[PDB]
Write a protein that binds this ligand. Structure first.
Ligand SMILES: [Mn+2]
Length: 437
């Protein structure tokens, strides 16, 4: 049908990192794109979520919740949303499997209407059709969202990248993206996390090969520090462990929720009886094991500080152990890294150097964001998922790719972008904020 009004409203993910949540309204129908949390600005063990009081005041029109990927930045606030509102949850195979976990983990029995979607799904509503396309990210079964209106598509990319080595459940949809482009994009909502970094990311194959060559020189025990969110990195050391006749052991007695669900669903490639439990590590010589230390915020680095300063509940460093920090150093956590480096050197461990000519990220750098802009060729553009400078960087790339400058909108949380059908205006503000927990 001919649509009249379009509204686009960020309640999270702008003027901050993480906590994606973008409200889109087409006439009398509202769609919530992602529902993320955020860890509180520079103490662990607590979470922040968006203020959905605007959604609650218009709860009769919320036709669903669409989840791009299974990161806490996309699904971390779903449970809390669902306490206050009943509405159907759309996501990929994995994304849904993990939302279910998050619910069971908070001992919530309330039944939820789930729909598993894929890149061939076309979910039909009264005014609009929602479709999807595959994106490349650090977690598999990531999707973009496309809301078909008569003014054209409203595309939300989620978090995404363009990597030439990832080709599985990480493969991008060059073709349906190119289709979305021609059909015509009204508005593109894209991830500005690394819009400041020029050029491209380092391909994951290259990062893996660099890790291998370094890990091949280690004559004693090896400990690798990951984010739990970065399934690609996890996967990579598993590959390497196999190729060096080593075995892998995660910190703790139980494997991490996300990883273990995805493993059980067959997302990872793990040769049989490669994982040794943390119980049975002393049994094998130093040179036959990689220990993987995962975490959420800075826990990965916090964990190494305990393992060196001997005070780790589970296992500690001994002299001769080699260490690898498989994370990028944001300025936030540049401090506690250097503190921890010292503590590791005191403990008498070899720090495997981080190659400075490598830039590793879940998110497209400048040229990767221009890749997505050149394929969608959007009329209007709205950079999200970043601080103010990050959104500005992305805005400039949009201009470069031929988007009209007057049609590029930088928005704080609660800003409302309306479309009468003639002009697009930012002539309203609504309720938004941070809700600690
Ligand atoms: Mn992500």
């Amino acid at each position: 049908k001919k649509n009249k009004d379009i509204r686009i409203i960020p309640l999270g993910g702008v003027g901050e990192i993480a906590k994606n949540m973008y409200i889109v309204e087409v006439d009398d129908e509202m769609f919530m794109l992602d529902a993320g949390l955020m860890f509180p600005e520079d103490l662990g063990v607590d979470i922040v979520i968006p203020d959905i009081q605007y959604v609650i005041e218009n709860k009769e029109r919320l036709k669903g919740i669409f989840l791009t990927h299974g990161h806490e930045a996309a699904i971390g606030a779903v449970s809390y949303v669902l306490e206050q509102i009943d509405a159907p949850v759309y996501g990929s195979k994995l994304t849904i499997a993990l939302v279910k976990e998050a619910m069971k983990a908070r001992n919530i029995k309330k039944k939820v209407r789930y729909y598993t979607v894929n890149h061939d799904s076309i979910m039909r509503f009264k005014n609009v059709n929602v479709s999807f396309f595959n994106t490349t990210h650090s977690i598999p079964d990531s999707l973009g969202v496309c809301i078909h209106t008569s003014y054209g598509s409203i595309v939300y990319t989620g978090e995404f990248k363009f990597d030439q080595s990832l080709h599985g459940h990480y493969a991008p949809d060059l073709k349906r993206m190119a289709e979305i482009g021609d059909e015509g994009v009204f508005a593109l909502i894209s991830d500005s996390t690394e819009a400041e970094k020029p050029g491209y990311n380092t391909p994951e194959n290259i990062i893996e090969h660099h890790m291998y060559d370094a890990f091949a020189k280690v004559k004693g025990r090896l400990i690798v520090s990951c984010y739990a969110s970065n399934f690609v990195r996890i996967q990579q050391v598993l590959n390497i462990a196999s190729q060096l006749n080593r075995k892998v052991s995660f910190l703790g007695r139980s494997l991490e929720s996300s990883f273990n669900i995805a493993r059980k669903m067959g997302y990872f490639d793990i040769p049989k009886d490669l994982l040794i439990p943390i119980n049975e590590v002393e049994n094998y010589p130093k040179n036959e094991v990689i220990i993987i230390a995962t975490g959420m915020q800075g826990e990965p680095v916090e964990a190494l500080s305990q393992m060196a300063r001997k005070k780790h509940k589970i296992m500690n460093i001994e002299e001769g152990d080699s260490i690898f920090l498989a994370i990028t150093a944001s300025a936030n956590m540049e401090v506690i890294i250097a503190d921890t480096l010292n503590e590791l050197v005191r403990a008498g461990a070899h720090i495997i150097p981080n190659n400075k000519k490598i830039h590793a990220s879940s998110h497209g750098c400048m040229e990767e964001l221009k890749m997505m802009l050149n394929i969608m060729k959007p009329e209007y553009f709205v950079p999200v998922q970043g601080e103010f400078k990050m959104q500005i960087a992305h805005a400039k790339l949009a201009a470069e790719t031929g988007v009209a400058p007057e049609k590029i909108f930088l928005v704080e949380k609660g800003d409302v972008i309306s479309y009468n059908g003639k002009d697009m205006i930012l002539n309203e503000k609504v309720q938004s904020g941070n809700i600690l927990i």
